[PDB]
Amino acid sequence: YENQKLIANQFNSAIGKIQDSLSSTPSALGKLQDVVNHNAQALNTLVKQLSSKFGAISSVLNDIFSRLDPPEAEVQIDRLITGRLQSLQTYVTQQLIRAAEIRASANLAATKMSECVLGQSKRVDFCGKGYHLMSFPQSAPHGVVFLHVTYVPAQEKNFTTAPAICHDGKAHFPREGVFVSNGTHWFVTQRNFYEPQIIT
Amino acid sequence: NFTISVTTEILPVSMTKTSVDCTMYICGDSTECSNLLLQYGSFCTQLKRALTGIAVEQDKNTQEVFAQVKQIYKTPPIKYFGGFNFSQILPDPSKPSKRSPIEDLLFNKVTLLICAQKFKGLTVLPPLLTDEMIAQYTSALLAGTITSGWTFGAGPALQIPFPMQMAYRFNGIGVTQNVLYENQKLIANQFNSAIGKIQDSLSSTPSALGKLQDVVNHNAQALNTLVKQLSSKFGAISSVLNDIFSRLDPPEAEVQIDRLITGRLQSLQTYVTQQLIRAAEIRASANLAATKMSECVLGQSKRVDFCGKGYHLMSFPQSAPHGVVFLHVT
Amino acid sequence: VGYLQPRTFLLKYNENGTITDAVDCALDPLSETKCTLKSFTVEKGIYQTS
Amino acid sequence: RDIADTTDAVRDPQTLEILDITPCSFGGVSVITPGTNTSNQVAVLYQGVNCTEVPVAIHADQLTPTWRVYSTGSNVFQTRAGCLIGAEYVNNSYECDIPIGAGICASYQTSQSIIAYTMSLGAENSVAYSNNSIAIPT
Numbered sequence: 079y080e081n082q083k084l085i086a087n088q089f090n091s092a093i094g095k096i097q098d099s100l101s102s103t104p105s106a107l108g109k110l111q112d113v114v115n116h117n118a119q120a121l122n123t124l125v126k127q128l129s130s131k132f133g134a135i136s137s138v139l140n141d142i143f144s145r146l147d148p149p150e151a152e153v154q155i156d157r158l159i160t161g162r163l164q165s166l167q168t169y170v171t172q173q174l175i176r177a178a179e180i181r182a183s184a185n186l187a188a189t190k191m192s193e194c195v196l197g198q199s200k201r202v203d204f205c206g207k208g209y210h211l212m213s214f215p216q217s218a219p220h221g222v223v224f225l226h227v228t229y230v231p232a233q234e235k236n237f238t239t240a241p242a243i244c245h246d247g248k249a250h251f252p253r254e255g256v257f258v259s260n261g262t263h264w265f266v267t268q269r270n271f272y273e274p275q276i277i278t
Numbered sequence: 279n280f281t282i283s284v285t286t287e288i289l290p291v292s293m294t295k296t297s298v299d300c301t302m303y304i305c306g307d308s309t310e311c312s313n314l315l316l317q318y319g320s321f322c323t324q325l326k327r328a329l330t331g332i333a334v335e336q337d338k339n340t341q342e343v344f345a346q347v348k349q350i351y352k353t354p355p356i357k358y359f360g361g362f363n364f365s366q367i368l369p370d371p372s373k374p375s376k377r378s379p380i381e382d383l384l385f386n387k388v389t390l391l392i393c394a395q396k397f398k399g400l401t402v403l404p405p406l407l408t409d410e411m412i413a414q415y416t417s418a419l420l421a422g423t424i425t426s427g428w429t430f431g432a433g434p435a436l437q438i439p440f441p442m443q444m445a446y447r448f449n450g451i452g453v454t455q456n457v458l459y460e461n462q463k464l465i466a467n468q469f470n471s472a473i474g475k476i477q478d479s480l481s482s483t484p485s486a487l488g489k490l491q492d493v494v495n496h497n498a499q500a501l502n503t504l505v506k507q508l509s510s511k512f513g514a515i516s517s518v519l520n521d522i523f524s525r526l527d528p529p530e531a532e533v534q535i536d537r538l539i540t541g542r543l544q545s546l547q548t549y550v551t552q553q554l555i556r557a558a559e560i561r562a563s564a565n566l567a568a569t570k571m572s573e574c575v576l577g578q579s580k581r582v583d584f585c586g587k588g589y590h591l592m593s594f595p596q597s598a599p600h601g602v603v604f605l606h607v608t
Numbered sequence: 609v610g611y612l613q614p615r616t617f618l619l620k621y622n623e624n625g626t627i628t629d630a631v632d633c634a635l636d637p638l639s640e641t642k643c644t645l646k647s648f649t650v651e652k653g654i655y656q657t658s
Numbered sequence: 659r660d661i662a663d664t665t666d667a668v669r670d671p672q673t674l675e676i677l678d679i680t681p682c683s684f685g686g687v688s689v690i691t692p693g694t695n696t697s698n699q700v701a702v703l704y705q706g707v708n709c710t711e712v713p714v715a716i717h718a719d720q721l722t723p724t725w726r727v728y729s730t731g732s733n734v735f736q737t738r739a740g741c742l743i744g745a746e747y748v749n750n751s752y753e754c755d756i757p758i759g760a761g762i763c764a765s766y767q768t769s770q771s772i773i774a775y776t777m778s779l780g781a782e783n784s785v786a787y788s789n790n791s792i793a794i795p796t
């Protein structure tokens with residue numbers, strides 16, 4: 079509250095830098111780009127695999143009945159009906175592999191929306207570098223994009239600390255904080271921010 | 279009262295990369311096959327692409343687990359951390375390999391001519407991060423979690439005395455910080471006694487590293503049965519290709535080796551498909567080890583029985599062959 | 609006068625079907641990298657070839 | 659024979675001296691290129707071969723690659739993944755740009771040429787640890 083004008087100004091500059099960050103580097107959406115590229119380049123080989131002879135005399139079955147007879151066609155078409163058969167099984171098996179990799183990533187993104195977005199996460203480095211504050215989801219083609227608003231300490235100052243102090247012949251431990259000294263006097267302060275307080 | 283227990287936990291991170299080429303495995307040293315092998319199309323580009331992807335991501339698994347800090351910290355020369363003895367996990371500079379006394383056991387209890395007897399078109403690529411820089415990353419993690427605590431994982435490293443970092447680890451448990459100071463001589467003595475048993479129990483049970491022993495056993499044995507099918511006849515006359523052409527006519531051989539060119543190709547397709555199963559298990563375990571490193575090491579976890587059985591205080595990573603070993607202090 | 613031999617090429621067609629450019633697949637490693645990548649522009653990185 | 663049951667040791671029919679059979683040297687060829695939008699010079703890595711076995715074959719009609727002038731190229735450098743031909747080894751370390759293997763990462767530096775170097779993991783820092791000193795952000 080004593081720093082809200084600074085914090086709100088600091089947040090607006092950070093969220094404006096996101097649009098410049100994504101629009102610059104091309105590898106920004108590569109997570110989603112290789113998802114659609116792997117699907118397209120697996121369909122392309124599946125289409126091109128029927129253009130191969132598979133050890134037969136031709137790649138089309140209508141030609142191998144006009145220029146070749148019926149009894150041995152069965153063995154000629156069997157060499158081509160199993161080449162496209164194994165090519166379709168190869169395509170399906172790689173699709174189950176990719177679906178398991180996607181579902182393991184969609185289960186993570188459902189966990190990210192449940193924890194980073196619907197609450198404040200105490201799991202460090204789960205929802206971005208630094209102490210988590212809140213997250214904002216954004217939609218994307220075949221994916222989701224988060225905006226992890228975090229809290230990064232800066233401008234650290236060295237200090238001299240003590241575990242406890244003894245005043246009336248008995249030890250005194252801080253309740254919520256740490257004893258520090260600026261060289262002359264002793265103060266109690268928060269662990270993650272510097273506000274000196276009189277030892278009370 | 280209480281006791282402080284150190285429990286080890288071993289997780290695979292990456293497996294051995296490999297690469298199979300198209301023609302030399304199937305019909306190498308045979309120019310009469312390579313024109314006939316073109317009659318399949320995407321038979322082997324797909325296999326090469328899949329194995330290269332299994333390999334590219336084997337370097338991403340090691341990068342996302344160990345390389346989590348942009349700054350390589352180093353330990354101070356003064357090795358008095360509050361009476362706690364950290365000699366077993368900080369690196370030993372007297373050894374030529376800058377590894378801890380515990381990492382030296384782990385790099386001796388895992389075994390791989392074995393990789394070089396598979397030279398039939400099979401090439402085992404080396405990892406991008408070599409062995410002496412993975413342990414450099416682990417030393418950078420240990421030099422931060424002792425001097426700075428959890429503060430290096432969330433911003434600038436902010437130094438703190440270790441007897442006091444453990445008071446904040448005690449405050450997360452549910453006990454106040456006065457129990458750590460009134461008993462630090464006992465706590466520091468109990469921690470070093472518990473960390474001494476890790477050096478003995480790791481070299482006692484043989485199957486302690488069975489988690490990393492079978493990730494290299496499964497990859498080497500599947501490599502072994504891959505080259506064991508080059509002697510497979512597949513219903514032909516001879517398993518050797520050149521004796522088929524010389525001792526049999528040109529028309530019959532092309533169809534005769536057509537079942538030797540797809541029987542041996544389906545043996546290669548079975549190996550690639552089995553690698554995609556095994557890479558997914560490792561990638562599911564590398565993301566688990568990255569979660570352990572980002573939460574148990576870079577902070578204090580409130581998750582029950584995640585970073586060790588008990589109330590988790592703070593953990594240490596240790597490098598390992600094709601994996602990582604965590605030392606959970608509970 | 610020049611001699612033809614069996615060579616593999618990559619031909620770039622325009623929208624009107626004319627051969628606007630071509631690249632050999634056996635001249636130098638950059639050309640065979642373009643030939644095995646099926647692109648006249650190659651991004652920065654490592655690529656496995658024959 | 660061996661574990662894989664391959665013929666790897668024979669005895670000559672004349673005299674009783676023994677001979678060892680190791681197969682002919684083979685390996686993949688990997689190029690180390692920047693973008694073609696950037697300069698068109700490349701570097702070539704021969705994967706997993708001894709590098710004294712490549713420059714014997716600087717001739718015509720002798721290998722699966724057809725180029726001859728590139729084998730007499732820049733300075734070779736035996737890494738742990740074969741030798742890299744076309745890029746020079748540079749002592750100081752930077753961050754990885756194009757990964758090669760066993761710590762070697764090539765990049766395009768300054769005239770301009772492709773150089774190879776060992777990876778730099780990060781900036782070296784020493785935390786000022788003391789048993790009575792703490793650091794608190796302001």
Ligand SMILES: *[C@@H]1O[C@H](CO)[C@@H](O[C@@H]2O[C@H](CO)[C@@H](O[C@@H]3O[C@H](CO)[C@@H](O)[C@H](O)[C@@H]3O)[C@H](O)[C@H]2NC(C)=O)[C@H](O)[C@H]1NC(C)=O
Pocket residue numbers: 260261262263
């Ligand atoms: C460590 O922190 C303490 C607390 O702020 C510092 O003590 C304070 O020092 C300033 C000037 O150095 C004092 O301000 C002036 O003091 C004179 C004394 O006669 C007074 O007449 C003025 O009106 C003005 O207040 C301040 O009073 C003093 N605080 C207390 C409680 O006495 C100390 O200097 C710091 N040490 C460092 C930075 O090394």
Ligand SMILES: *[C@@H]1O[C@H](CO)[C@@H](O[C@@H]2O[C@H](CO)[C@@H](O)[C@H](O)[C@H]2NC(C)=O)[C@H](O)[C@H]1NC(C)=O
Pocket residue numbers: 236237784785786791
């Ligand atoms: C507090 O500041 C720094 C740490 O933030 C302490 O160490 C100095 O900074 C670097 C850290 O290694 C060294 O290169 C300097 O030489 C250090 N300075 C000295 C004088 O040793 C610094 O010592 C601390 N100062 C005080 C007054 O506590």
Ligand SMILES: *[C@@H]1O[C@H](CO)[C@@H](O[C@@H]2O[C@H](CO)[C@@H](O)[C@H](O)[C@H]2NC(C)=O)[C@H](O)[C@H]1NC(C)=O
Pocket residue numbers: 279280
């Ligand atoms: C908590 O348990 C520890 C472990 O037994 C106790 O430490 C021992 O205490 C006895 C007597 O108090 C000594 O004779 C032993 O030498 C101590 N063990 C070690 C390893 O030094 C400790 O006293 C217990 N705490 C309380 C409050 O009883």
Ligand SMILES: *[C@@H]1O[C@H](CO)[C@@H](O[C@@H]2O[C@H](CO)[C@@H](O)[C@H](O)[C@H]2NC(C)=O)[C@H](O)[C@H]1NC(C)=O
Pocket residue numbers: 363364365
């Ligand atoms: C930390 O533990 C190590 C391991 O026990 C200690 O090294 C031993 O030190 C004693 C006495 O100096 C020797 O008798 C042993 O032979 C040492 N063992 C080894 C393996 O070197 C070390 O002294 C301990 N350090 C502290 C500060 O407690």
Ligand SMILES: *[C@@H]1O[C@H](CO)[C@@H](O[C@@H]2O[C@H](CO)[C@@H](O)[C@H](O)[C@H]2NC(C)=O)[C@H](O)[C@H]1NC(C)=O
Pocket residue numbers: 672673
């Ligand atoms: C036949 O085999 C014999 C030995 O089995 C060979 O005899 C040796 O030949 C070498 C050189 O030719 C001599 O240095 C040895 O002293 C010979 N040994 C004996 C026991 O005679 C012989 O070379 C082979 N070939 C022919 C054509 O005889």
Ligand SMILES: *[C@@H]1O[C@H](CO)[C@@H](O)[C@H](O)[C@H]1NC(C)=O
Pocket residue numbers: 622623624
């Ligand atoms: C292709 O044909 C269209 C139709 O006339 C023309 O506008 C265009 O310039 C042509 N492109 C060429 C010749 O490159």
Ligand SMILES: *[C@@H]1O[C@H](CO)[C@@H](O)[C@H](O)[C@H]1NC(C)=O
Pocket residue numbers: 695696
């Ligand atoms: C090509 O390089 C120039 C600078 O040399 C750069 O401005 C441009 O964006 C690059 N284009 C692509 C497609 O990489």
Ligand SMILES: *[C@@H]1O[C@H](CO)[C@@H](O)[C@H](O)[C@H]1NC(C)=O
Pocket residue numbers: 708709710
């Ligand atoms: C490569 O060849 C050199 C010289 O012949 C030799 O010293 C070196 O040991 C060889 N390396 C391997 C791995 O065989």
Ligand SMILES: *[C@@H]1O[C@H](CO)[C@@H](O)[C@H](O)[C@H]1NC(C)=O
Pocket residue numbers: 749
């Ligand atoms: C580069 O390093 C090598 C060995 O690491 C050394 O022999 C050589 O003198 C170094 N060159 C320079 C200019 O430092």
Ligand SMILES: *[C@@H]1O[C@H](CO)[C@@H](O)[C@H](O)[C@H]1NC(C)=O
Pocket residue numbers: 358789790
């Ligand atoms: C810090 O450790 C050194 C060496 O063990 C010791 O001389 C010094 O008194 C210690 N500082 C405090 C405040 O106890």
